[PDB]
Amino acid sequence: TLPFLKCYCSGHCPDDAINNTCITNGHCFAIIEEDDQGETTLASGCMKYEGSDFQCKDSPKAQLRRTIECCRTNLCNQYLQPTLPPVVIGPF
Amino acid sequence: TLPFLKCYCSGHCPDDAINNTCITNGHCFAIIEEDDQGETTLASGCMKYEGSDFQCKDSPKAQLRRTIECCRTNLCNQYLQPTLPPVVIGPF
Amino acid sequence: LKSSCKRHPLYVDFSDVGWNDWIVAPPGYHAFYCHGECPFPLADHLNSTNHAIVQTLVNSVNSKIPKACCVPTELSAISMLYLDENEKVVKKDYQDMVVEGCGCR
Amino acid sequence: LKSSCKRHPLYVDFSDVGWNDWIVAPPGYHAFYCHGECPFPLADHLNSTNHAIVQTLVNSVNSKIPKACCVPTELSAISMLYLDENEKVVKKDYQDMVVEGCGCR
Amino acid sequence: AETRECIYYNANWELERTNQSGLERCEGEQDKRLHCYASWRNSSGTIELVKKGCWLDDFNCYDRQECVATEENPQVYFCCCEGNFCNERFTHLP
Amino acid sequence: AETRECIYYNANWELERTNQSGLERCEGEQDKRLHCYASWRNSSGTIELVKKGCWLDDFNCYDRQECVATEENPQVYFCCCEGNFCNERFTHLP
């Protein structure tokens, strides 16, 4: 229940982040997402334990296309690179 | 530091208000105010102790014309009816 | 005023969000949410802080400074029964899941 | 993103608001305020609750449900010296006056 | 205030390091109802008891003296009720 | 951590039911400076000591070894400083 896990962060780094690294009691995460204007970005950081199951599960019904993935070992997200969910075409 | 004061409330009544009455550890208040569209209303209620000195003092620079007055005895605001601050005219 | 800070309805249905595959019970629950303006003065039931009260006063003088925000100030828990990654059943009383009271902060 | 939930500057000058007649010291202070969007996902430093996390997910699915709000999650105190109604001098360490951290609630 | 007692059971009492069976006194907030629950698996005929214990105020358990699993054919059965030891016995009916 | 001691004084020690004089050990949060303060009235020549004691981290007290009231002619004088017993003595200079 104490801050023991270390993660890499990018775009979600806290202010006291040391060398693009954040500390947490929860999980590390990486997320690839497409914004309202079709741009895709990869970000990552730390996620507190409370509510991590909800966030790591995410929802298929999210309005924006995205994939978030979590892991719970030191710097496990440095090479974590999720792929976007496929776009369903049709009925055409 | 416990809820001991009883006040009359109108327009600021909590949900559990009994017969337009609220309980507090702070002060009772009554306020007369003129909205963005020139309408004036009288309201009243309970104000928690923390921050009551700031709220009861108010600010002369408030953008809307208003006068709030506080008192600290049971139902002391039932007949409390403040008057609006005068409108300064000129230089004409 | 209908527009002031208060609790609003919100039922979270696990089947709709798609969490019914890992959550066994309940099928969903009333979470509610807080929304509404925090104008001057802040009444007792809005459980504000000295800071939110001061910010409310500043906003009253200078609109460039935003008003305090309506958020949960008292939350309650609900029991959930779910399956962990190992398909193992877990019962947990999740804290801070339901809005009981809203205030300005 | 420049638009995300974070602390912003705010100096409260007692002379400007008009409280210098009753507050002797300090002349004013940095109160700061919180503002910014709370988009998905909510990082650790945003100190969110289970409820705000769930609301953030619901908003992601249904925009009619508002996002969590950016508010102070850690506040600090300052000492003030003032005159009560009886023109008597009082020293008090006012709690929750300064925003130290912002989060989504 | 209102009190409550339920039948306690934990199939995975090993790793969790708890008793396998017993009783539990529920603890609830002001004016909030208290319930009991049971959950099990149905390995085609044979029933595997998974867990039993206290459950917090839940609309789906209100005014139910008996514990009944209503879900047609779930992977994990569940029922809750409002009554002391009301989870001592349970049934399944879609 | 950082510690602090100041000269304590209370002109209204009666109603407040406290000592009229003494010392005070300040208590501050992590990495937050600690100060001392003094406040008095100047009844045309004669000085009425009002209060002295600890004061929390305040930009206006930073790096001040002496307690100096800078306000031209206030109704109530005040000065704060950063140093043990730094409020033992004070002065007034606009």
Residue numbers in the entry:
A (entry chain B), B (entry chain B): 32 to 123
C (entry chain A), D (entry chain A): 10 to 114
E (entry chain C), F (entry chain C): 6 to 99
What does the paper say about this structure?
Bone morphogenetic proteins (BMPs) and other members of the transforming growth factor-β (TGF-β) superfamily, like the activins, growth and differentiation factors (GDFs) and TGF-βs are secreted signaling proteins that regulate the development, maintenance and regeneration of tissues and organs. Members of the TGF-β superfamily bind two different types of serine/threonine-kinase receptors termed type I and type II receptors. In the present study we analyze the interaction of BMP-2 with its type I receptor BMPR-IA and its type II receptor ActR-IIB. ActR-II and ActR-IIB bind activin A (Act-A) with high affinity in the low nanomolar range leading to activation of the SMAD-2/-3 pathway, whereas binding of BMP-2 occurs with low-affinity in the micromolar range resulting in the activation of the SMAD-1/-5/-8 pathway.
Crystals from this complex comprising the BMP-2 variant L100K/N102D were obtained under different crystallization conditions and exhibit distinct morphology. Analysis of this complex yielded a hexameric ligand-receptor arrangement with all receptor binding epitopes occupied as expected for the dimeric BMP-2. Inspection of the receptor-ligand interactions of both BMP-2/receptor complexes (comprising BMP-2 L100K/N102D, in the following termed ternary complex (1:2:2), or wildtype BMP-2, in the following termed ternary complex (1:1:1)) demonstrates that the ligand-receptor interfaces are highly similar. The BMP-2 double variant L100K/N102D binds to ActR-IIB with an affinity (KD ~ 140 nM) almost as high as for the interaction of Act-A with ActR-IIB (KD ~ 60 nM). Confirming this, our structure of the ternary complex (1:2:2) comprising BMP-2L100K/N102D shows no additional intermolecular H-bond between the lysine side chain and Cys59 of ActR-IIB. In the structures of the Act-A:ActR-IIBECD and the ternary complex (1:2:2) of BMP-2L100K/N102D the Lys and Asp residues form a stable intramolecular salt bridge. Accordingly, Lys100 and Asp102 (in BMP-2L100K/N102D) exhibit low temperature factors indicating that both residues are quite immobile. The "rigid lid" centered above the conserved H-bond between BMP-2 Ser88 Oγ and ActR-IIB Leu61 amide might provide an effective shielding from solvent access thereby enhancing the strength of this particular H-bond. The double variant L100K/N102D shows a large increase in affinity for ActR-IIB, in addition the affinity for ActR-II is moderately increased (threefold), but binding to BMPR-II remains unaltered.
